[model samples]
Target: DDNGGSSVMNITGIYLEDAKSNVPDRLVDFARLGQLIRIEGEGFNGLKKVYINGYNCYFNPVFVSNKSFLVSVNSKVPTTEADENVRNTIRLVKDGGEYVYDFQIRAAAPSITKISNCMPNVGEPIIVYGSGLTEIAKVVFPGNVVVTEGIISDLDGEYFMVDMPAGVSEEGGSIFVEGSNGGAYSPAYFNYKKGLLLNFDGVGAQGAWGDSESMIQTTELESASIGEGNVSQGAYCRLPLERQLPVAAAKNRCAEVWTAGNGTDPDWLTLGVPAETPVAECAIQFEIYVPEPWSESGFLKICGQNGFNGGEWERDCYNYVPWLVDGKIVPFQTTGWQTVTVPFSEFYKSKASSGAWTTFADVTATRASASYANFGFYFENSDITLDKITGASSDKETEFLSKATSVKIYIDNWRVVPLTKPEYTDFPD
Candidate 1:
């Protein structure tokens, strides 16, 4: 049994649909402009037109059906031209009938997608990339300094560029951007001190701790290529195991570095920090790229020198054992240059066997009281292990030796930064 005629109907409701989840959102409080929306209801036959926020939108008839239809929010719809409430109404036309649904349309809030340079000098330019950045009204720096004009935005609102403002905040903060549509807060992308210990861009009292031939200082070639895509500015230090001298031979390399013997020689480098540089809010930030998986043989010890009196004066050793993170073990090794930031507070001098760690205030006070002025890295291998041997006495110690393999680590952008700042606390991908 079939009827020859049909009656006019109206859309009772609207929904935002997700095809992947196959779930329909009934309450779409707000959706960004230029978004595609799905509609489902009883009366969708002979759909002739669609309107969004009073603007006619283009929709393919192929998407129309008796129960559902798809339509775009129409990018041409101007944010300023929107109603006072900033709300949009969707109107569907079918068989000489019209149905309208009120929906909120908002300008996409701005975000910082990329920074041209994270450690630029004071006068350098920083280009920021993101979407929905048009008719830029102002740009805010880390310190809340504002720039009303002279900022450049792309024609497509995908990006904007700003010059480094004068008198920026040293205690890094989030960058804020305000456009005609809305504003956004950026992650801490700037380092307050920009304290360059060694960038290979220029020498600042940094040199090889051991034999000069043990470390090669170069740019984007040979050992330099190790840091590859992760160099902070220019140049890096390449620590080759093959060229390194044995541990016992390089003991004069300074107490700042730790060396291992028995077929594994460690490469060492050192940097001198300014006197009384506050360690409470400071950290060591660097970029490292390891070409291959570093087994236990790959070890690094970063220490702050306390005294040169031949006594055990080097305090607070921040050990970078490849298989550990935050006192817990992790299978860690990567080819890409990854930023490693160790807060000075993490430099606990207490013996791990005692399970007691030094507090930040104590370490800070100790560092300020002593003339221990040098801070740097020592790269070597290890043989100590906790893995018990099978059918062996409990008193018998098993020497777990990490076999020496030919490997190189690329390192760059060795600097000090505020540990509490965005750059250290919130790292970018």
Candidate 2:
């Protein structure tokens, strides 16, 4: 049907940039900045100009029809900074005629990258990292415990704060949020004690000696409340053989710790992870506490079923270089025990790519076939190039010096947890 040369335009609804439908209740009045909103109206054919928040918006021509159109609310579309005259208005021009529609746009959606200490003690404040977090008023913990009060969110959105609530489920899962710029989710590892393959105290056995080289020696396990508020529990492993080693800058194969060996193959499925779950949906989680500042010097190489000095980087291995943040070198220190989640997709050679190591079964296949599966961490003190640190796709080799560090990193409660997150929809599907 045509508009019959009519200059009349009536804009009514806005929706997510997915497949559109005639469902009347599917439209929304407000959306986040940078969101592609499907605009529905009349007299859209031959539309010459489109402006959102006083800025020209980019829209696909094919998606534009006589009845409706789609436009991406650009990141540059000033929200709070928008001019008072043009704020929250979309101006459409066609055939010497124009129409304006008011719309509500908020900041970008929130993304929760790190939960300072996933297993924080009750009443202790935990800092959450990532972006777009603003005025986080509600926090849904693992056990569906909602903390509606005392949540602190930064003005700049670098991070947010939450005082750990009591009785958070030990059965653990992801943290969900609401009443902010937009809802977000954390990796499925918070308080996930059920997935702990080893807690160093007693839960599961710790491996030592190995294939020795830089193997862990079952000695000097500490237990006296380290880390500020997220305090260490029971016993934890503090690395570097003899407490004083010369692994400063000399080797990338420093001290190593293991969880399984020989007759101790840990059936990872004990945590209830399905055999067919995508390896990328899962990660190795551990709580680490650094006593001293560690930066530009040493890092922990996470190895999966490989030797201490084995050709990792050639297999399932990832480096924990806390100092390297956003392509620049910075001091790395933990005021408290923080959870570290390295997804299986980050592994070098045996990553969950197209074929090899694609599923949870594939990731465990190496350990399943091996007589002894050594899953652990290695302290590596070696120079790293800029490209290697940032993955900047540059062939140039520029090395960052690795210095001698005396920082003893303490870690405990090693577990394999899910990294998958469920989509947060305001309305249920």
Candidate 3:
């Protein structure tokens, strides 16, 4: 048994790096090329050879153990042009024979990690990010849309920025960017007609409706170290701890980002009347960042008027999962920026109702449709208690925002884009 000789060999598990922590990640099903991964199983020691997706990998025999082995997803392995359904298997060989572990191999498709603003009025810049994005040839918006010229790329090929097109399909769809290396699709769709409301960057210092000082401030140095895209060089609006606002207040307080027509106005955001496209077809999008080793509990509320009709939508920064907070499993907080896309249909008129605040068809009929004139960003960690609602299974729990003391978080690139179709849009057109 000590010699690494076994009659049977198996790869019981595969993992990626946990973004929240340094722990091994098994939840993900696919691995990107050049990514480091852990293969857990038996009979790995004294291995003669190893391969991934049929491409030979470089693994030192000294690092192999009976239970696990570390391997870098070989870069020389082809993926950019591979089929989506291609099987990525891990092969191990010894003097006796060979063993294979089937897995998924993801291509070098360029991902749109972040956009300056998803729902910018025409002419605004929409910056996109991801690796393998070098030599971008074209950008496609929903409904077979295209942005062909005047695109700018960074020296590192990590991001590209382009101006919003003059026209977008009212019924929005996915963003497809064609790069020389490969192509990628946005996780969601970008509605052409939906207009931008508040972008914290151009608005400057935030104001408050009440006596409390504004906690949301724009600072180049105070943002998340890892962002979805490069906008500020490092600039973003954050709720830092220094701005001690009332945490125990009976009523929720907030820092006003915009109060209808007060901030920059894009033609799409302000309408003489509602647009023909239904509000249900559009949604608000933004990026969120929680610093590492996060412990203080709280929630971020995105309040709106008009389209949302005075509804205050909220998302918890920390829902208090023992596995996450214990810090041994997932990281205490997100390692990088995460996207939040709220469909207009989710804005309920009342806090207690489960029904849509606005109907799918009704929104399309209204002018300025889903665009909210009044908006505010609020945070608190007072005695709020989140509920432990149950889902269909034991591992699944519905998280609710409770109360706590204080927490710091960042947000950027707010957009109002179309609700995307489920699939990526591929192309030659």
Best by lDDT: 2
lDDT of 3 by residue, 1-429 (tens): 444645467777887754554454654566777777877777776677777767788987777777777788887775544333434677888887789777766545566655545544566567777776766879988677688898877645689888768667765556888775556776455543344344454532333333435434323225434543323324456654455543443334433243343353455434212444344555666666665555434445555432322113332111223223322234345444545566564443312244334443343323244454344455533322222222235433434233344555666655556553344422221
As for candidate 1, its clashing pairs are none
For 1-429, candidate 1 gives per-residue lDDT tens digits of 111224454554566554544344443555566766776665676888887777788888887767667777777875545664423667777667887777656566566655544555555566677776776789888777889878988766788877767877865555777775467655443543445555555534443334453343232223334333333355555555434533331232222222121122111112222334344445566666677666544466665542432212234666556564433345566545565666665554543335333444444444455454454565655443432212235424644355544556656666655433233111123
The per-prediction tally of clashing pairs is 0, 0, 19
lDDT (Cα) of model 3: 0.54
lDDT of each: 0.54, 0.76, 0.54
In the range 1-429, model 2's lDDT, one tens digit per residue, is 534434577786877764453453357878677777777767788787789878887777777787788787788777655788998788998886899988877787788888887777788878888887777888999888999899888877778888989889989888988644668898777888888888877778887764555767766577788878788878888876555576666576777788756576468877767778887788888889986887777778887765546324546678888887866778888788888877777776444344567767777676677655877778788777766544557733666777776678888888888877777654454
**If candidate 2 were superposed on the true structure by all CA atoms, what would the RMSD be?**
5.6
Give the distance in Å from residue 297's predicted Cα in candidate 3 to where it truly belongs. 1.7
RMSD list, candidates in order: 13.1, 5.6, 14.4
For candidate 2, the 10 contiguous residues with the lowest summed lDDT are 17-26
Candidate 3 residue runs with Cα over 4 Å from true position: 1-173, 177-194, 201-210, 213-235, 245-251, 254-280, 306-338, 350-355, 358-373, 382-404, 422-429
Q: Show where candidate 1 strays beyond 4 Å.
A: 1-193, 207-228, 245-281, 306-315, 322-336, 350-364, 383-401, 421-429
Each model's TM-score?
A: 0.44, 0.76, 0.43
Worst 10 residues of 3 by lDDT: 309-318
